[PDB]
Design brief:
The structure is cut from a larger assembly and holds chains A and B. Chain A is mainly β. Helix content of chain A is 4%, strand content 46%. In chain A, strand 6 (91-93) and strand 7 form a beta hairpin. Helices cover 17% and strands 31% of the residues of chain B. The chains are: A mainly beta, B alpha+beta. It is classed as viral protein.
């Protein structure tokens, strides 16, 4: 019997939107439909969000979510005001009943429907 | 001193582009909302001098120490419309509009030398960022209250 952290994930839940992009192109012109779903999750900070140095300073908040629902990389997660690309340090205890990912705020505005 | 701000002025009202969206250089300024296409006048390039003039004025008597120099100031365009604000600049730089608006900006303007779409590693994502190069040449000056010579008394001797 595979251990299932699922029940150990409900208490800490939070509502959040999980979107994915399925890019569409004709004659090499970019359009992006969206797929958004209300999914369960839990959020903690992932890399303490610092200020990098460049020609202009920039900063991207990091969150790392858990959920009972599967989360592929090429998906975004919005919880407060800015979606996070599910890019890094993710791991799928799918057979153990959940999965986790870090998150990168796409400083672009949130993909509502396009 | 004023040169970088001047080229910022020139790019401000060549592209008919906003105040708050042109930030200077490697100062401290947050680039929030990546799509808000910024422009920054990178002045990190070494400015090298060319000559050190010295003129003198007679009646309203002061003099004038000048220093002609040039710097490879680069322009970094950001934002979803970086490419356009690159090209549309990289091409209007040598029009009427530019050459007519840079009236009093005591600053020549050379042709755009090269471009690059070197983006920036925005942490597991790539934000549009384009550099365009062009040598800029100007000449700071200062004025000093010296004073002239009205005559010269003197004596000679011989064997």
């Amino acid at each position: 019997m595979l251990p299932n952290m699922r029940s150990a994930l409900k208490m800490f839940e939070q509502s959040v939107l999980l979107k994915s992009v399925e890019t569409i192109r004709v004659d090499f012109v970019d359009d992006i439909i969206i797929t958004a779903t209300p999914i369960r999750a839990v959020v903690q900070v992932a890399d303490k969000k610092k200020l990098n140095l460049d020609s202009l300073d920039w900063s991207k908040q990091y969150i790392w979510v858990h959920s009972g629902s599967k989360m592929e990389i090429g998906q975004f997660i919005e919880w407060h005001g800015k979606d996070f690309k599910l890019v890094a340090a993710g791991d799928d205890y799918s057979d153990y009943g959940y999965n986790a990912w870090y998150g990168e705020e796409t400083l672009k505005p949130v993909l509502v429907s396009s | 001193s004023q040169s970088i701000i001047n080229v910022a002025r020139y790019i401000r009202d060549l592209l008919d582009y906003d105040e708050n969206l042109i930030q200077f250089d490697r100062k401290n300024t947050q680039q929030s909302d990546t799509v808000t296409g910024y422009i920054v006048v990178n002045g990190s390039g070494v400015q090298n001098v060319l000559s050190h003039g010295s003129s003198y004025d007679g009646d309203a008597e002061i003099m004038e120490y000048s220093k002609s120099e040039s710097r490879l100031i680069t322009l970094e365009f950001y934002g979803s419309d970086a490419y356009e604000n690159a090209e549309l600049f990289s091409l209007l730089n040598q029009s009427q509009k530019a050459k007519e608006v840079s009236r009093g900006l005591g600053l020549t303007i050379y042709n755009v030398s090269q471009a690059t779409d070197v983006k920036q590693l925005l942490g597991y994502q790539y934000g549009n960022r384009v550099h365009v190069d062009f040598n800029i040449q100007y000449c700071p000056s200062v004025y000093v209250e010296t004073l002239r010579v009205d005559a010269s008394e003197f004596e000679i001797l011989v064997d």
